Design a protein around this ligand. Structure first.
Ligand SMILES: Nc1ncnc2c1ncn2[C@@H]1O[C@H](COP(=O)(O)OP(=O)(O)O)[C@@H](O)[C@H]1O
Ligand SMILES: Nc1ncnc2c1ncn2[C@@H]1O[C@H](COP(=O)(O)OP(=O)(O)O)[C@@H](O)[C@H]1O
Lengths: 62, 375, 160, 114, 375
């Protein structure tokens, strides 16, 4: 899955203008992907909160 | 969730499971090693109802459940049931997922392979624990007890281990696996209470007798004079309240049950009992070892909480032991919880950070790895 | 005062227009605009509530604090929300879950009296010695000394 | 106690949580921006020739693969809590249904009408 | 009358049939399980008249009719008469019928199985019901009562079932079925009123004595003290108005009839009474069940409307029960109607929507299907 999701650049046969543009394409992809990681981590913490609240609600009504 | 990626520790006996995180001074929770299942046909609808209940759920809903123990005298024979007990332990009481923490489990080394192999496999494959370590009960008991040398008497629900350790080393030729345990003491008490007019033959009844034993029984340092009086007088009987409000009184039977540990013939076992077995483990060690073990008999596990047991054991060993020498018993309050406490201590030692199986070594080698990495 | 203002704030435009149109049945025309209390049972039914005769009388028994014999329009909305709870949207469990988490500073799964007081004093509204406890005892349906997540959702349904 | 004191305080109580929740969102945006600056640092591509630009490209290939490996594991963790929430929520619903399910309704009216 | 295909519910006993639609908390109407027939030769013509009368028609024209009850001790012996009663119930008075609605029936756990088979056949082939379910009366009482646990005394017209339920499950080994019900209590009353000079033999008379019982009788918490005064003083007597303007004055017979519940020997039955019977349903369950059943004695069905029954039952069980234990009794206003009400609750529960036998499964299997699909 990760091999399918990761982006790959042409490198060895490219000239300087082509390399500047290709380096830029992954940089923005990485940047956007790091942003998703940050938001997913925050979602995880908010969902963990709901999990412990729910674990107590089960015991409180049982 | 914790302030460190501390190992989680779970001490799974044939009786109860003690669990918490490494570095604490107590398990966070204790569960019966029980998975319960309904033995009745449902009549009402929309009642919830599980296929099986575990731990404390199994005990709280026991009125209509058959209660089974996945562990047989120290060996897990039902690992699907232990996985459910563990999931409950880790996620509902400790509130920590093992995926982010190493886990330490315990067994006697006398255990015939399957327990350490399956314990390692469950944590690596159903819980995805990053690391594992199966520990020695004698080691754990000595750390908890403040000793490096002595004999661990862990007379709990399953099997008595009676393993001697000198300067941190095992003396394995002197370890005597003994088929005399707290579970047998319960069965004996169910039968003698039946003679008194209070039959105990079902699961609920077995749990009641175990509760009676734990709260009313004692061994006595002098059982002969104690029974001469207890069997003659109601003044030595203690009342126990049964779940339905009925009352049972128990007299010499109160100690008669624990006495089995010194009188194993009571349950049909061909044995000298725990005091002689301990003595023989001392005897089987070299002559320059024997004196250090006589002076350091260490109580652990269960049944070691009976009144008169530290004195009963020290006096029986003293009687078997040579003169001049001082025979002594160490019986810490960390009794019954000592294997778990030792797990917390061991998991956390800097000299034990290389003893952990990682979840890499495990997959390259498979569960047989436990025989190369743990002991 | 503020209960009457709040009932107005909580009713939507497509609802308050029906409430005043139906409630105006309380004046016969060419009178004094009194708007009497005996007509409350009729309007509960005109607006879609389906009360029994006992319920019609209870709505009447709960109005007329000053003995005037009348019901005002804002007073009507207050009496209706206590009979037929036509709030504005009333939010959702997801919205209150995220808000619940803000009062639960220690992430304990409940709002105790100290958190309840800090959050309210922080609004600028003066909190007195008997306040806070008065809300805790309203949300705390099980009498456990705190308002938990489930209790919170019941407690604030219809709150803006 | 008058309904207006009780309603206004629970109203004010929810309004302060809303302000605090708006702050939680702003704090997350602030932290995400800082996290991005350090997690995905900018490329010093200007002024570089062929070999130097190729090294940046190769480093980025390794970095994009690593950001997806970690993203995937985090995504899986978010997913795991969602699944447990759905399961815990249903257990709660059934425990509570037992309290009101069988007895709460608008009944026995035609009983008098007839 | 109705705008939805809600399930219909009917509680069919040897007394009356309570009926209405699911979602209500009361029957819409009550239909006496009666078919009336003239016992006289007609002389006038152009008088209307029926070949047979049912339900309330049968009672309204009873002056010259003999009134028969198609159900005996919970069993329909005459189902042709029940079809006429049901046709009236559904099409004339409730204005609903199985033809356009699924139907739930209420039954005892040990009701002869052939009786459900016949009712199942009738609702599917005579009334064309799209689906069916036959529910346990104890279940229905527990839903109506807000419980999942308790001993349900369903006090029928011809039989009392007495079944313990725990956590929604049947505990059938502790069922203490008793051949004593409201119709037998009526028999005792008419015999003792006969002794006072008011024989009740013929149909009109049979209906009057049943009506006397329902309006004048009670059990009281203490029979012997109630009798010491009732047998000694006119202040305990009540005059009941008979249809022709005459009255009957009744003294301690007012409580001796109801007392048969505690004293079945009054009608020749070899039984210790309903409190002993309830006691055994609790006492024969495991001790970890017993505490919850002692706390949940559930009165349902008829005869529970007798003043003092809640106190008479709680005190007798407490006397039979172990000490310390708390004995509690449930006796809600939803009495006599709680079985029907539970039927409404069950038929409408979302958890029960897949519990219905469809008129597909029915024709493939035939009427015996009720024995596999319901209970
Ligand atoms: N008061 C007591 N009386 C008799 N036996 C006891 C008492 N306390 C503990 N034991 C026994 O301890 C046993 C549990 O063994 P345990 O040592 O805790 O296993 P583990 O070491 O893996 O945690 C039970 O059979 C229990 O009856
Ligand atoms: N005050 C009362 N005294 C004696 N019996 C009563 C009284 N009220 C109701 N019952 C009895 O209730 C019975 C009818 O309701 P019920 O038995 O619950 O329906 P079903 O027989 O189908 O279960 C009749 O036998 C009636 O005499």
């Amino acid at each position: 899955i990760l091999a399918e999701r990761r982006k790959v650049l042409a490198i060895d046969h490219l000239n300087e203008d082509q390399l500047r543009e290709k380096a830029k394409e992954l940089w923005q992809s990485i940047y956007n992907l790091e942003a998703e990681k940050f938001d997913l981590q925050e979602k995880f913490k908010q969902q963990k909160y709901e999990i412990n609240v729910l674990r107590n609600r089960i015991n409180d009504n049982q | 969730d914790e302030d460190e990626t501390t190992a989680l520790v779970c001490d799974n006996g044939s009786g109860l499971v003690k669990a918490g995180f490494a570095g604490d001074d107590a398990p966070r929770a204790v569960f019966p090693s029980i998975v319960g299942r309904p033995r009745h046909q449902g009549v009402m609808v929309g009642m919830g109802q599980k296929d099986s209940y575990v731990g404390d759920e199994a005990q709280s809903k026991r009125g209509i459940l058959t209660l089974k123990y996945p562990i047989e005298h120290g060996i897990i024979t039902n690992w699907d049931d232990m996985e459910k007990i563990w999931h409950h332990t880790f996620y509902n009481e400790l509130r920590v997922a093992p995926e982010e923490h190493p886990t330490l489990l315990t067994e006697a080394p006398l255990n015939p392979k399957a327990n350490r192999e399956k314990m390692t496999q469950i944590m690596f494959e159903t819980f995805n624990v990053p690391a594992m370590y199966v520990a020695i009960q004698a080691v754990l008991s000595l750390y908890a007890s403040g000793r490096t040398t002595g004999i661990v008497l862990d007379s709990g629900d399953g099997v008595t281990h009676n393993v001697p350790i000198y300067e941190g080393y095992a003396l394995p030729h002197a370890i005597m696996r003994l088929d005399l345990a707290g579970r047998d003491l319960t069965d004996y008490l169910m039968k003698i209470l039946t003679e008194r007019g209070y039959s105990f033959v079902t699961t609920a009844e077995r749990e009641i007798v175990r509760d009676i034993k734990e709260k009313l029984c004692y061994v006595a340092l002098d059982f002969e004079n104690e029974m001469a009086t207890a069997a003659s007088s109601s003044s030595l009987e203690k009342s126990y309240e049964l779940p339905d409000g009925q009352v049972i009184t128990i007299g010499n039977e109160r100690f008669r049950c624990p006495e089995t540990l010194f009188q194993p013939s009571f349950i049909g076992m061909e044995s000298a009992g725990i005091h002689e077995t301990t003595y023989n483990s001392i005897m089987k060690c070299d002559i320059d070892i024997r004196k250090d073990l006589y002076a350091n008999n260490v109580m652990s596990g269960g049944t070691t909480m009976y009144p008169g047991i530290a004195d009963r054991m020290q006096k029986e060993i003293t009687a078997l032991a040579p003169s001049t020498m001082k025979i002594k018993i160490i019986a810490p309050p960390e009794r019954k919880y000592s294997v778990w406490i030792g797990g917390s201590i061991l998991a956390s030692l800097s000299t034990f950070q290389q003893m952990w199986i990682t979840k890499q070594e495990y997959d390259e080698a498979g569960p047989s790895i436990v025989h190369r990495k743990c002991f | 005062d503020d209960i009457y203002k709040a009932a107005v704030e909580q009713l939507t435009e497509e609802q308050k227009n029906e409430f005043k149109a139906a409630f105006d049945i309380f004046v016969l025309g060419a009178e004094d605009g009194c708007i009497s209390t005996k007509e409350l049972g009729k309007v509960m039914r005109m607006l879609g509530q389906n009360p029994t005769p006992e319920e019609l009388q209870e709505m009447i028994d709960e109005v007329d604090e000053d003995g005037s014999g009348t019901v005002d329009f804002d007073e009507f909305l207050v009496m209706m929300v206590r009979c037929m709870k036509d709030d504005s949207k009333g939010k959702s469990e997801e919205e209150l879950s995220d808000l619940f988490r803000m009062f639960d500073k220690n992430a304990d799964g409940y709002i105790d009296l100290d958190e309840l007081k800090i959050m309210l004093q922080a609004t600028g509204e003066t909190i007195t010695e008997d306040d806070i406890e008065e809300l805790m005892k309203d949300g705390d349906k099980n009498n456990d000394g705190r308002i938990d997540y489930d209790e919170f959702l019941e407690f604030m349904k219809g709150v803006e | 106690i008058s309904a207006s004191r009780k309603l206004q305080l629970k109203t004010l109580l929810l309004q302060i949580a809303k302000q605090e929740l708006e702050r939680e969102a702003e704090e997350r945006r602030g932290e995400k921006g800082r996290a991005l600056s350090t997690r995905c640092q900018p490329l010093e591509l200007a002024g570089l020739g062929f070999a130097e630009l190729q090294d940046l490209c190769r480093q980025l290939h390794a970095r994009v693969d690593k950001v997806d490996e970690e993203r995937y594991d985090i995504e899986a963790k978010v997913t795991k809590n969602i699944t447990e929430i759905a399961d815990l929520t249903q257990k709660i619903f059934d425990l509570r249904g037992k309290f009101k399910r069988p007895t709460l309704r608008r009944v026995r009216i035609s009983a008098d009408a007839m």
